[PDB]
Design an enzyme around this catalytic site. Structure first.
Site, PDB file in Angstrom:
ATOM      1  N   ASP A  74      -5.874  17.274  56.225  1.00 25.55           N
ATOM      2  CA  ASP A  74      -7.132  17.079  56.984  1.00 25.55           C
ATOM      3  C   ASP A  74      -7.493  15.596  56.925  1.00 25.55           C
ATOM      4  O   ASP A  74      -7.791  14.988  57.945  1.00 25.55           O
ATOM      5  CB  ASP A  74      -8.200  17.888  56.293  1.00 25.55           C
ATOM      6  CG  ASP A  74      -9.350  18.229  57.173  1.00 25.55           C
ATOM      7  OD1 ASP A  74      -9.320  17.892  58.365  1.00 25.55           O
ATOM      8  OD2 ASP A  74     -10.271  18.871  56.600  1.00 25.55           O
ATOM      9  N   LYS A  80       0.311  14.653  45.232  1.00 24.62           N
ATOM     10  CA  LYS A  80      -0.213  13.816  44.142  1.00 24.62           C
ATOM     11  C   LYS A  80       0.589  14.109  42.892  1.00 24.62           C
ATOM     12  O   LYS A  80       0.048  14.411  41.817  1.00 24.62           O
ATOM     13  CB  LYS A  80      -1.737  14.040  44.030  1.00 24.62           C
ATOM     14  CG  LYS A  80      -2.450  12.956  43.205  1.00 24.62           C
ATOM     15  CD  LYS A  80      -2.234  11.533  43.753  1.00 24.62           C
ATOM     16  CE  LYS A  80      -2.800  10.537  42.768  1.00 24.62           C
ATOM     17  NZ  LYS A  80      -1.986   9.295  42.712  1.00 24.62           N
ATOM     18  N   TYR A 106      -9.316  24.521  50.128  1.00 24.06           N
ATOM     19  CA  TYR A 106     -10.214  25.118  51.135  1.00 24.06           C
ATOM     20  C   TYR A 106     -10.363  26.669  50.995  1.00 24.06           C
ATOM     21  O   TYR A 106     -11.427  27.216  51.285  1.00 24.06           O
ATOM     22  CB  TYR A 106      -9.782  24.740  52.558  1.00 24.06           C
ATOM     23  CG  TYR A 106      -9.936  23.270  52.925  1.00 24.06           C
ATOM     24  CD1 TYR A 106     -10.738  22.405  52.105  1.00 24.06           C
ATOM     25  CD2 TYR A 106      -9.363  22.754  54.107  1.00 24.06           C
ATOM     26  CE1 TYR A 106     -10.922  21.075  52.469  1.00 24.06           C
ATOM     27  CE2 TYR A 106      -9.522  21.413  54.470  1.00 24.06           C
ATOM     28  CZ  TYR A 106     -10.302  20.584  53.622  1.00 24.06           C
ATOM     29  OH  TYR A 106     -10.506  19.290  53.990  1.00 24.06           O
ATOM     30  N   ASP A 116      -2.640   8.782  48.073  1.00 23.38           N
ATOM     31  CA  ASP A 116      -3.349   7.484  48.032  1.00 23.38           C
ATOM     32  C   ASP A 116      -2.471   6.323  48.610  1.00 23.38           C
ATOM     33  O   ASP A 116      -2.973   5.436  49.299  1.00 23.38           O
ATOM     34  CB  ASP A 116      -3.853   7.135  46.617  1.00 23.38           C
ATOM     35  CG  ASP A 116      -2.811   7.402  45.509  1.00 23.38           C
ATOM     36  OD1 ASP A 116      -2.158   8.470  45.501  1.00 23.38           O
ATOM     37  OD2 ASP A 116      -2.688   6.579  44.555  1.00 23.38           O
ATOM     38  N   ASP A 141      -6.847  12.927  60.121  1.00 22.10           N
ATOM     39  CA  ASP A 141      -8.015  12.192  60.678  1.00 22.10           C
ATOM     40  C   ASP A 141      -7.818  10.670  60.671  1.00 22.10           C
ATOM     41  O   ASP A 141      -8.235   9.958  61.625  1.00 22.10           O
ATOM     42  CB  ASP A 141      -9.307  12.578  59.950  1.00 22.10           C
ATOM     43  CG  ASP A 141      -9.885  13.918  60.482  1.00 22.10           C
ATOM     44  OD1 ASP A 141      -9.289  14.491  61.411  1.00 22.10           O
ATOM     45  OD2 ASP A 141     -10.957  14.327  60.025  1.00 22.10           O
TER      46      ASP A 141
END
Lengths: 351, 351
Positions: free
Chosen positions: B242, B186, B140, B218, B246
């Site tokens: 984020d 990851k 970001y 994942d 959510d």
């Protein structure tokens, strides 16, 4: 013509790929498809026979065929091998050799199997979503990349042709389904997301028969749990697709139900998502649904035989209710379940 | 001492922040907390009164306080303003001014509210997960970043101190809960993921009372749907946080139940996740649960009053069953629901 290279692989791979072949032979016989297939050594079995997982004969057979029907690959036995000849490296070599740039993974809640889903029945009902994941670019392969003792860095980067070609595969797939694509990005924060969105919108103008909407990846993690039945086709970049495909994959509540297709320039590869399950190799219990649905994917996405793919899916849907395998709480062996799929295919044909 | 700057903001913000204050005043009176608070102008109301969303008096009051109790901010009315003075820019200026680097968002399925979840009741039961999201770095904000007509690029980058400080906030939060952190990365594909994992493992050695496990992002999208009740605290980078926050946020099945805390160097900010809901401003129907739970978060994370935060959560849990607000299918107004929370707090005290 339907020339298929069959790479049955390891563990339950030979059993479930043969279940898929019985289905394809029944269709070939009923429909006059011109099916021709040959079995080639791949994966752990190839390592054991030839010293490498993807030997020359197999690379040649894959090149010469119009599609690959691939079983499961790998296992405990080969885990201690140099990377150069591991089963997983074989799979990367297979996909790279064909420049497969789109992975398609459908998650479907078959009617009457809502009970299997982690989602409440009313939310699970009607889920049939196809996640199309860009396979060769984005942060997984982006440069610059590296780490020091102070920091590390990876680059999510996409060029226009990479975005275009995965988008086209999504629009084409949507034509065969319910003509609706949602493209997923992070366009409200990231330049790559803005670029992805504008490129997909531009490509979409070539597919006026397909509706296109855009969603942010964080919103999509909400929507795939709250209203997954609302989606048809979803297309996105590599890391977001890895995450959302994994999210979609748990909605049906059973690993044995999930097929995969990898599409690109060369011969497209169709395989189960499940692994080689070596503890049940040779028992005749593996659920062959993933493999059979991978053959339906082959019909649809390699050969454009969409009506036939839908017949196979409907017969599988009925078989899962009539003679569920052990992973669905039933007791049907692999062959009994395949026979049930064939009975339904036969019955639907005799109209 | 408990010095709180109250920034009630816009829409339903004044109503629900006052519900939270009634709760905090009841606790202050029962427990002798030394609560002192002052109300400061913020957001759309500040723009209308002063011409900017985060005026000097408010920046000063926020600096001088030990925590901020913030209502909802923004709305349709201010959407046409220059970015420089928008309500959303006020919120970024507030968080930056305090260098808040960790966002904590808990998702809890209160007992007897499993019916609200999109997940089957047996899976929803017992969910109480806290997602801790690094707020100031990662892709970001990473450089290099940009786009041309040919390609676009964003950089997921983290330095060691950024990873350390968000990890410490997660370990501290886990001490107050069930002493279990899952760090998410990851690491099987990305250098930043490897770096994140090793840094968190090293930081974890300072918290021998907290168990630490690592999961890939994942896999976590699978686990938050299939077995979310298995988690306690989860910590991760900005974009993954984020997405997963959510995902967790939809498990309780109601926006009005979700609080947020942003923690860092300056004064920590506690606010509802919901927006300003201007269509129901002044009606006395807004569900004040998110605000009240944000005050419980303030007790816990700013003041370390964990026992008190748990009492507020238990009273809220009972009130949601006894006098559910309209968003839960009931008919309790904001004040009636707050009164029910106070009855339960009083009853639990009188042991």
């Amino acid at each position: 013509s339907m020339k298929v290279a069959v790479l049955p692989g390891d563990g339950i791979g030979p059993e479930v790929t043969e279940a898929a072949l019985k289905v394809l032979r029944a269709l070939d016989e009923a429909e006059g498809l011109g099916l021709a297939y040959e079995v080639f050594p791949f994966g752990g079995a190839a390592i054991d026979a030839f010293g490498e997982p993807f030997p020359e004969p197999t690379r040649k057979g894959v090149e010469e065929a119009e599609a690959v029907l691939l079983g499961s690959v790998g296992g405990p036995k080969w885990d201690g091998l140099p990377r150069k000849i591991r089963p997983e490296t074989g799979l990367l070599s297979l996909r790279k050799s064909q420049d497969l740039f789109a992975n398609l993974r459908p998650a479907k809640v078959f009617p009457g199997l809502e009970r299997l889903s982690p989602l409440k029945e009313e939310i699970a009902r009607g889920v049939d979503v196809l996640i199309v994941r860009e396979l060769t670019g984005g942060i997984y392969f982006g440069e610059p990349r590296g780490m020091s003792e102070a920091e590390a860095w990876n680059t999510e980067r996409y060029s226009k042709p990479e975005v275009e070609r995965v988008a086209r595969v999504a629009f084409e797939a949507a034509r065969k389904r319910r003509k609706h694509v949602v493209s997923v990005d992070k366009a409200n924060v990231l330049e790559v997301g803005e670029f992805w969105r504008k490129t997909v919108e531009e490509v979409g103008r070539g597919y006026p028969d397909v509706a296109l909407e855009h969603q942010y990846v964080d919103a999509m993690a909400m929507h795939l749990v709250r209203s997954p039945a609302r989606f048809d086709v979803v297309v996105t970049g590599n890391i977001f697709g890895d995450i959302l495909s994994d999210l979609a994959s748990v909605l049906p509540g059973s690993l044995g139900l999930l097929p995969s297709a990898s599409l690109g320039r060369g011969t497209p590869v169709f395989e189960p998502v499940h692994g080689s399950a070596p503890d049940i190799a040779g028992k005749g219990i593996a659920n062959p649904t993933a493999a059979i649905l991978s053959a339906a994917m082959m019909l649809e996405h390699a050969f454009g035989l969409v009506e036939l793919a839908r017949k196979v899916e409907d017969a599988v849907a009925k078989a899962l209710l009539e003679t569920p395998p052990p992973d669905l709480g039933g007791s049907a062996g692999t062959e009994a379940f395949t026979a049930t799929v064939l009975r339904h295919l036969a019955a639907a044909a005799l109209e």
